[PDB]
């Protein structure tokens, strides 16, 4: 009961191993989430899993 689809609209650049890196248009999903502070998804472009900036990605 959670096959929604998300999309990134900002070309972010992972500076550390805490998050990943995706460009505007990449496709990702909300595998999970903590509460208030970035989220967690798996970029389907390269398959890199890591935290994502919630203030940069959004649902569509």
From Swiss-Prot:
Tissues expressing the protein: Expressed in skeletal muscle (at protein level). Located in the thin filament of striated muscle.
SH3 domain ranges (all copies): 1-60
Subcellular location: Cytoplasm, Myofibril, Sarcomere; Cytoplasm, Cytoskeleton
Disease (UniProt): Nemaline myopathy 2: A form of nemaline myopathy. Nemaline myopathies are muscular disorders characterized by muscle weakness of varying severity and onset, and abnormal thread-like or rod-shaped structures in muscle fibers on histologic examination. Arthrogryposis multiplex congenita 6: A form of arthrogryposis multiplex congenita, a developmental condition characterized by multiple joint contractures resulting from reduced or absent fetal movements. AMC6 is an autosomal recessive lethal form. Death usually occurs in utero or in infancy.
Complex and partners: Monomer and homooligomer. Interacts with TTN/titin. Interacts with SVIL. Interacts (via nebulin repeats 160-164) with DES.
Function field: This giant muscle protein may be involved in maintaining the structural integrity of sarcomeres and the membrane system associated with the myofibrils. Binds and stabilize F-actin.
Protein's name according to its UniProt entry: Nebulin
Species lineage: Eukaryota, Metazoa, Chordata, Craniata, Vertebrata
